[PDB]
Amino acid sequence: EWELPRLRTSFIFQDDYKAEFFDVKFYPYSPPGAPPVFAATSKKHAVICRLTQTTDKDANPCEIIQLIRDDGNEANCASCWSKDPITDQPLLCIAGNEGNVKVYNVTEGKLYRTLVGHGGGINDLATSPANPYIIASASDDTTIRIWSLAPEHEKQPCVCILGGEGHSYDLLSVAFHDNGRYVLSAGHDQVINLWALPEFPNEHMEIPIVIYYPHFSSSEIHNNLVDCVAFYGDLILSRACHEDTIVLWRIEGFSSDDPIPGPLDAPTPTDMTKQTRSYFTPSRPAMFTRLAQFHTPDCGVQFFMRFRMYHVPGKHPILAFANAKSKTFFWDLARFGEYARFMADLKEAQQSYNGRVVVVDQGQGISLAQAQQVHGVVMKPAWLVPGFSRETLQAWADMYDLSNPVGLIKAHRSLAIDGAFVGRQVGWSPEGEWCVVVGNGNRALIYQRWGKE
Amino acid sequence: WTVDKIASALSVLAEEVPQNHSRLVNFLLEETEKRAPQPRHLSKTDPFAHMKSKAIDAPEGVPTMDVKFKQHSGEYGKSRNSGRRFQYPVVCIKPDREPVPPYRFHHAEIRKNILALNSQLNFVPPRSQKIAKRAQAEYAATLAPYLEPWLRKLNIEGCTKSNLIRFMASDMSPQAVRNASMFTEAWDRVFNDQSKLRRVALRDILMLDKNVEPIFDNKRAKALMQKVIDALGSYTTLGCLICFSHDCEHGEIERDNQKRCFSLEEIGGLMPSLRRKWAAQIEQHPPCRNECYRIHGPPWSENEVGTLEWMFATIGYSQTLRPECFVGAILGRPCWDVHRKLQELDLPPVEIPKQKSLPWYDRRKKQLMSDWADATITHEHAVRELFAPCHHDGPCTAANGCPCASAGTHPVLCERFCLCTAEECPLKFTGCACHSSGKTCLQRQGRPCICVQLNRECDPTLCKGCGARERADPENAYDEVLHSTGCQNVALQRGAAKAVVLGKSQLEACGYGLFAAEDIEEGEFVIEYTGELISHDEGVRREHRRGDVNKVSYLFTLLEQEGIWVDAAIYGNLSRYINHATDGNIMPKIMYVNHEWRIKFTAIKDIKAGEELFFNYGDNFPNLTKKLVEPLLVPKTTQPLFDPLSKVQLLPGQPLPQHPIDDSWLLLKHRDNLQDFIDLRPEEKEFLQEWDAFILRRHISSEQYLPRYFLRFVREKADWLVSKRSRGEEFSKLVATLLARRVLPERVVIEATQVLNDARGRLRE
Ligand SMILES: CC[C@H](C)n1cc(C)c2c(C(=O)NCc3c(C)cc(C)[nH]c3=O)cc(-c3ccc(N4CCNCC4)nc3)cc21
Ligand SMILES: [Zn+2]
Ligand SMILES: [Zn+2]
Ligand SMILES: [Zn+2]
Ligand SMILES: [Zn+2]
Ligand SMILES: [Zn+2]
Ligand SMILES: [Zn+2]
Ligand SMILES: [Zn+2]
Ligand SMILES: [Zn+2]
């Protein structure tokens, strides 16, 4: 359960822009323990594989079950999943450089519908966790559109535009909060915005609702174009070009237990020198707080590279990201606390026992009981590899110490990739045992853990 | 103490900062991990269960693609073979709709031009300093909460936040100031190491103090008559003369975004207008339902006596209006009460040179004669500069420094806001003389219309023969019978545009264009060009930030010499989609409209419904940076048509979408602007914002319509006004200011007295 993935399968899909995989998402609406199925999006194709675990190390766990080509002129780079509201069968939304979302009935290989209205290319798509029929598009036209696939909205499916002056150049990333009413947006203008959506009427909407002001807005978390942003609970993960970090940070005064503010609660830009404004703020405080920076060396000048946190009840949160130099990085978030506990027990035992302290690997056939019988005894997690030397203590701090908000957390697992590879996107299976990294050369890297080989 | 001993102490207290941080980050990670959300909306069945590998084994005419797979094992990710390749058929799905023409930003509609602040150029399609400052600011925010608990822990005499703030602007005990210094440096020794970029001077922490900070927040608003002037200060300073809002689209934005409102203080403040009213009065009813002094005749707060003071001064030497009934309804007092107080109080003395009439202009016949085009620049808007309306004491001459006769290259006429009158000043504008049971104030008229010749629209108040009073009222904008006779030159105040519709332009070069949705005849007003009003440098900054520095930026010149452009990139209306053509069917013109300058389009050919509109862009859109380096229904057309808001395609023949203009975001901005002042008390902001939220929605250009709107406000808010002392008192100052301007007739102060008393008696429940 402390286990981190290993490379199990890779493949190269024939060059179809004569070329990159730009997106990968596992289907999220399958009944528990169903075979995981993901779609990888290239510039012209959606490749849909089932993954099945194998006793045979040479068996190919991957089955390609559907292969769809965008037969129009668009080059795509974004996808998300939804469902038919009547039939419940899977819907794949694909969007690209013409400014249209295609919705595909993938089990039947048919168009479900087209979502038209953006004035420029779409770079990112996200389904609301609260409502599988609500889609958000981020576009070069600098706006976000919220679309609904519910039956009452078929004659006009744009239910909301996030407009105004909060953004002034191409958007690269859009993300939903788990409650479905807070949206993060970010892009080339280096602004990260948090918007509060209204509730949308259960009936036809002649015009979409327009929002002119985000409730939180800052351009100061990063010093460059922001190409990926996400909620982790109510915390925020975000990444910019040139920085080689994924930043964990926090909006001061933001909690999703509080009621949802309406549009006229939003702050307005009354002072044109302020680069951060926020509805949520409580000496003048920060309106945001940098918490931690995961280190992702060697992204170079590459941008449009996305991370994904695996976040599910009763399993460890895992941050995954691949750089621009053939490496995939993992962080187990539960290791941070385990390390804090073990280092707490260590210093508390070095003071109560003058240094007469004995460390012992957990997870063997032992207990801090069988450990105490043999002679202070401190239980060390099995995944903490080397009184300890200084280099060992620095090696442990670098991966696990969360004391410096501008420190650099080294990946807990760094798996090299054969040949040159720039990662574009990472996706996780529902039960967390597969992790698929897609990227240039139409390549997909399939990582596994908890296998059956 | 010693600088090194306290720096030693700070160093050990600093030890809690990273360990608290680790406690905080670790705490939030575990809360988040345990609050992790369960996936929702799962299906009862696996929808892919029935789908096999589509790999081909050793089709026909079906597209095919290859995929080569590799397997990997071990810790190193080593492959177990060179890998196997498979072919798959391809399902080709075409989209059923085409994208709409491209665009940037969300295009929102505004009913009138809005005044834009200047922006900072931060994004373009020294950075070294900007990163440095942000690293420091983030660190100052981290340590700020630690200053005073540390001062507490240290317990150093003279080491108080208040006193470090004193040493920084450098009374403070002798060994206090000694400790002050030793604390300041040492802080710098422990926290402002000039080697590191994550450094912060104690001074940067003290400047975040809630009492210190507003010292640098430059958002400042501003005998018996000195009390009045001061009590009315907020209204005389902020109250717009054009539109009567306290935060509105008028006035001048300076470079640092300080605004000079177009208000009474721009023309001398209260006294020059008020003395003038007193005088006009010198050269010259029913009882209230609250125990009036007509029929008859609890200590007083100084606010209550102030209230009656300014209402008495402002009403002035009136003949059919008196402070009692109105003050009474404002306080909670019977009209005899304030009559008693008034008589108990016993509350300045009041003081025309014949001028050479100008031959190019007769203000009694309302006529321009002779050389007039060569004599004046009143009509030529591209060369005009914006001068505060004259408020001098003399005749308007270069000698009294009258800017109207003298500030420009030629004299301009004095306008409605100049303190001169038509009887004194031969430059005073008096409206037009047109009157006709048919159409009047046209272009190609007996006598011509002086308003048309001056390139202005008619004034509701001064143009009394043409019927401008009614035809410039937006509430009669759709009375076709009214507008079929009378004044034909108030189209912008009428505010009604020809039916138009967004579409894909016919030009293989353009994206969108605008199309006529009804028949338009030559000479008719089509639409106004609205947008954000900006300065020269703001236009330059925006041309950079939009990559224009192949023309991508369009900035309509409104006033060339003054330097105002109209940018409809984001805010404007459908006129922003009108395409260029050397022979267009419409034409723009800049018109003076009640001391606003505005852009109208008039048809120059006959346009039938479904035809596209074009105008010759001309020099209307200069390149600012490069100059500096030197039954209404969707017509049937060939082009697709779009809803301006949703961009859904319109069905030719369907009802023209008429969307109500959404302005809540704009009222918010104006509400927030008044709330930003450190200069205003909560009770002033509360009422000012209430009034502005009402009056802004009415888009007033003319004093003609203020009395009506004022009365609709006293009636919708009468309950609210009586609920709370401060609200009536603040309402009273507004009306004081409006009566000193002679813009509120006596008949509405009385009707407001009755509307208020009825709301107050209604509250006596
Ligand atoms: C580089 C961005 C710059 C800041 N900017 C600002 C705006 C308002 C704007 C627009 C836009 O709002 N237009 C609508 C429109 C108006 C408002 C008026 C008329 C008469 N007609 C119109 O259509 C479009 C584009 C743009 C980008 C790519 C493009 N492509 C053609 C083929 N090459 C690849 C894609 N075309 C247009 C840029 C804009
Ligand atoms: Zn105004
Ligand atoms: Zn009375
Ligand atoms: Zn004058
Ligand atoms: Zn004048
Ligand atoms: Zn004059
Ligand atoms: Zn006339
Ligand atoms: Zn006139
Ligand atoms: Zn007229």
Numbering used by the authors:
A (entry chain A): 8 to 25, 38 to 301, 307 to 399, 404 to 414, 489 to 555
B (entry chain B): 197 to 254, 259 to 325, 360 to 404, 427 to 428, 430 to 479, 491 to 552, 567 to 579, 588 to 637, ...
The article reads:
Polycomb Repressive Complex 2 (PRC2) is a histone methyltransferase complex composed of core subunits Ezh2 (or Ezh1), Eed, Suz12 and Rbbp4. PRC2 trimethylates histone H3K27 (H3K27me3) to mark developmentally repressed chromatin. Ezh2 contains a split catalytic region composed of the SET domain and the SET Activation Loop (SAL) but is inactive without minimally associating with Eed and the VEFS domain of Suz12 [Suz12(VEFS)]4–8. Pyridone inhibitors bind to Ezh2 in an extended pocket that overlaps with the SAM binding site.
The hydrophobic drug-binding pocket of Ezh2 is formed by residues P302, R304, F305 and H307 in the SAL domain, and Y809 and Y878 in the SET domain (magenta and blue sticks, respectively). Clear electron density was present for GSK126 in all regions except the sec-butyl “arm” group and the terminal piperazine ring of the “tail”, even though the drug molecule binds in a site that is less enclosed by the ctEzh2 residues compared to the human structure. The carbonyl and amine groups of the pyridone moiety of GSK126 mimic the carboxylate and amine of SAM to hydrogen bond to the backbone of Y809, directly competing with SAM binding in a manner similar to the human version. In the SAL domain, the imidazole nitrogen of residue H307 hydrogen bonds to the carbonyl on the linker between the pyridone and the indole moieties of the drug, and residue H307 itself is stabilized by hydrogen binding to the carbonyl oxygen of residue R304. The backbone amine of residue R304 also hydrogen bonds to the linker carboxyl oxygen in the “neck” region of the drug, whereas the side-chain of residue R304 undergoes a conformational change compared to the SAM-bound structure, and supports both the indole region of the body and the pyridine region of the tail of the drug via hydrophobic interactions. The side chain of residue P302 also provides additional support for the latter. The piperazine region points outward toward the solvent, similar as to the GSK126-bound human PRC2 structure. We then tested the inhibition of ctPRC2 by GSK126. In contrast to human PRC2, GSK126 was a very poor inhibitor of ctPRC2 with an IC50 value of about 100 μM (and protein purity in Fig. S2A). While residues 656–661 fold into a tight helix in human Ezh2 and residue Y661 cages the drug in the active site, the aligned region in ctEzh2 (residues 845–851) contains a partially disordered flexible loop (dotted line), that is located away from the drug.
